[PDB]
Amino acid sequence: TAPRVVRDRDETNFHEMLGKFRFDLQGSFKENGDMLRDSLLQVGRDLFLVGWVKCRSRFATGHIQGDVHALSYMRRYLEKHVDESVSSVRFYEENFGMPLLEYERLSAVNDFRAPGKKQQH
């Protein structure tokens, strides 16, 4: 687990680093956010996403991790290239350069609560 202090430069290692994404969406969505979740999953597979994501009617956040260069494209896609209406984009934290990764597969957390408890809640 050698840090970037060993010899990363602009020759060949400039595109050999990992990190975490930074995004926090907020605003109303069509139906219950089904369109946004489906669109994000298809694009995420092409970029070989590892982290997870959360989608809902209003709340939309998550933690996405991957390559330093791969995540750069997603920043522009999820800021202007949005078919739905977006109010504003927030940020929580970011970090570039880290040995190995935490997650292994891309998945979206969905509300699988039973319908019986929905009325009580």
Residues lying near RNA in the complex (CB under 7 A)? 56, 59, 111-114, 117, 121
Q: Quickly tell me which residue has 């956040």 as its tokens.
A: 61
Nearer to RNA, 22 or 56 (CB): 56
35 binds another protein (CB under 8 A): no
Cα 91 to Cα 14, 32, 50, 82, distances in angstroms = 25, 23, 19, 17
5 is in the binding site of which of RNA, another protein, none (Cβ under 5 to 8 A by kind)? Answer: none
Residues 44-63 that bind another protein (CB under 8 A): 48
Nearer to RNA, 59 or 73 (CB): 59
7 is in the binding site of which of another protein, RNA, none (Cβ under 5 to 8 A by kind)? Answer: none
Half-sphere exposure of 32 (CA within 13 A, CB side): 2
